[PDB]
Amino acid sequence: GSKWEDFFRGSRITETFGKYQHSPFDGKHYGIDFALPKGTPIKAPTNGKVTRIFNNELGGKVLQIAEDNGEYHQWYLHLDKYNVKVGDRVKAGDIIAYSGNTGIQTTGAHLHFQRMKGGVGNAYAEDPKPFIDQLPDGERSLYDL
């Protein structure tokens, strides 16, 4: 009826690239965290091809993609469902998966996008922010809201 209005505040990002707290014991986040409703399709930011597909006990489901120059990598943690297989070519704006609260103990879902160069792992990560900064629809080149 009359009452429905949103308790909105700020943008959808939980955490960007950097340390969790002061002191050296709470380490670095190597990605970007888009808070999403469960079942939202994740879109390809760039044209590329799938390298690896696997499921982690604490990070949930994981998709790995490679860019067309072959040096840059793209991780996608906290998926409900895949829309591609290993060895599929993709094109920017195409659905590659759907995000869901997999790995997460109680909290709502967030797409963890992790951007890497020369290989894949924490040390290979660069920064996702300046990459999204040039995309056709920005962060909406990665999700369907």
Residues with a catalytic annotation lie at 110
Closer CB to Zn ion, 66 or 109, in the complex: 109
Amino acid at 15: E
Helix (H) or strand (E) holding 129: helix 129-132
Which phi and psi angles does 23 have, rounded to 5°? 70, 160
Closer CB to Zn ion, 43 or 112, in the complex: 112
Length of the chain: 145
Burial 76-87 (b: 16+ CB within 10 A, else e): bbbbbebbbeee
Using CB under 5 A, list all residues that contact Zn ion: 33, 112
Closer CB to Zn ion, 88 or 127, in the complex: 127
Q: In this structure, is the dihedral angle defined by the CA atoms of residues 58, 18, 126 and 25, taken in order, positive or negative?
A: negative
Residue 51 near residue 143 (C-beta atoms within 8 A): no
